[model samples]
Target: DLPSAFEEKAIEKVDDLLESYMGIRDTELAATMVELGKDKRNPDELAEALDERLGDFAFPDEFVFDVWGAIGDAKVGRY
Candidate 1:
């Protein structure tokens, strides 16, 4: 169930995101992991499998910086 959700999110980025960031281009490997994950549901194992496979990605650390001050609070006006 969880792995199915992961698979849904994976397909969104597997082509570009997987190649760019994950450095993995093997569909067989990806599908294999999904099956294993579905059976085990162990994040550590998944993370372990992903370890050392990822090289990098575009716009690295782009979200690390906080963008504020321009907007006070989005919810302030709503509620």
Candidate 2:
């Protein structure tokens, strides 16, 4: 199970990052995040989406892949 604080932090980070890159405000970004998080257990799809968005931000491919792996590992037992 994810800790409440960790989940909140993840939401905050995702929201801020989306708003920064996508030019959306917090409310709209939060809604977008909700839509994205709906498929949190699907590693391949989530990784693809993350790759696309993070690439738009010029984030390194290594970082994107590492984060995607970590996210997948985190869901190993739960989903």
Candidate 3:
């Protein structure tokens, strides 16, 4: 809705990366707010909003990079 398959993957990958990398608890809400937020925003804007939602959790630097890369690479043909 926001962008591409990347939007769909963001939270799922965020949760997966955080959990597997840290071996910890649920970090962010699952598939949350995205459906609600998609209509009014652009993909990059929605990505920021997603980051805000995930801000409370501690995600690994590399994991965060990979997550954003996967999302953006497609949009910019950088993949």
Candidate 4:
């Protein structure tokens, strides 16, 4: 089963990035991220998946890196 805390952290981190990117948060994208994150068991896998799945967004490599970092930490029980 997916951990609730990790999922919450995923959504939270994704939104934060969106806000920093555009001064706006896309709830739609954030929700999508939750599902995408759930599908991958590892942050590196999710990093590529985000690029493939949301290619239209043109997210920077650093953005993907930070997202991966956030969820990776969450996975290991880091707040």
Candidate 5:
């Protein structure tokens, strides 16, 4: 029941988003984003992941929150 197609697309979007801001792509972290988003199903868990990784990127709070919310919506089947 794996949605490899969606996960591949998700990884691309995550890569682009992070790269646009970070000046480089972190494929490992982007893959982790897809992992947490697809498996965890909890927004707080996503937040914790962000707190650890995105914190290092110093991404703006508004942008970070926006990305997290988007992941929540996507996992909730809103996409």
Candidate 6:
């Protein structure tokens, strides 16, 4: 059975967190991305897919940053 939609939303938020920081120059963000890419749940795949599909969607930088942060947070719980 699936968790509640709210749980799913929480996961999504974490995903966004990671994606946001992916563009940063910090070593922590880089390490996080590497760890996330190796996750069994494959959140990095989702991020790559979203990044590819949504590349032309034209979001503001802030929105992109927010989503990346959410991605990070989600993966943190997984690890």
**Each model's TM-score?**
0.36, 0.38, 0.41, 0.76, 0.62, 0.35
Residue 34, candidate 4: Cα error in Å is 3.2
* Consecutive 10-residue window with the lowest summed lDDT within model 5: 1-10
Per-residue lDDT tens digits for candidate 4, residues 1-79, read 4458877787788789889875788866876876776677776777778778887777777777777777677767787
> How does candidate 6 fare on TM-score?
0.35
Sorting all predicted structures by lDDT, with the top scorer first, yields 4, 5, 3, 2, 6, 1
* Residues 1-79, model 5: lDDT tens digits: 3465556656666777777776788877877777777765665766677777666666565545555655655655456
In candidate 3, position 47 carries an lDDT of 53
Off by over 4 Å in 5: 1-3, 53-55, 62-79
Residue 46 Cα positional deviation in candidate 6, in Å, after optimal superposition: 9.9
Ranking of all candidate structures by their TM-score, best first: 4, 5, 3, 2, 1, 6
Model 3, span 1-79: residue lDDT tens: 4456645665555567557776664534534533423332354555565567666656455655555554444335453
- The window of 10 residues in a row where model 3 has the poorest summed lDDT is 33-42
* Candidate 3 regions with alpha-carbon error over 4 angstroms: 1-4, 25-56, 73-79
Residues 1-79, candidate 2, lDDT per residue (tens digit)?
3354434444554555545555554644443433454456564666566556534444344533443443333334222
lDDT of each: 0.35, 0.47, 0.51, 0.75, 0.66, 0.45
Residue 1 in model 2: lDDT: 39
Residue 42, candidate 5: Cα error in Å is 2.8
Best by the lDDT measure: 4
Residue pairs clashing, model 4: none
- CA lDDT of 64 in candidate 2? 38
In every candidate, how many clashes are there?
0, 0, 0, 0, 0, 23
Report the Cα lDDT for residue 79, model 6. Answer: 28
lDDT of 3: 0.51
Give the higher-TM-score candidate: 1 or 6.
1
How much does each candidate deviate from the true structure in C-alpha RMSD? Answer: 11.4, 6.6, 5.9, 2.9, 3.3, 10.5
On the 0 to 100 scale, the lDDT of residue 8 in model 5 is 61
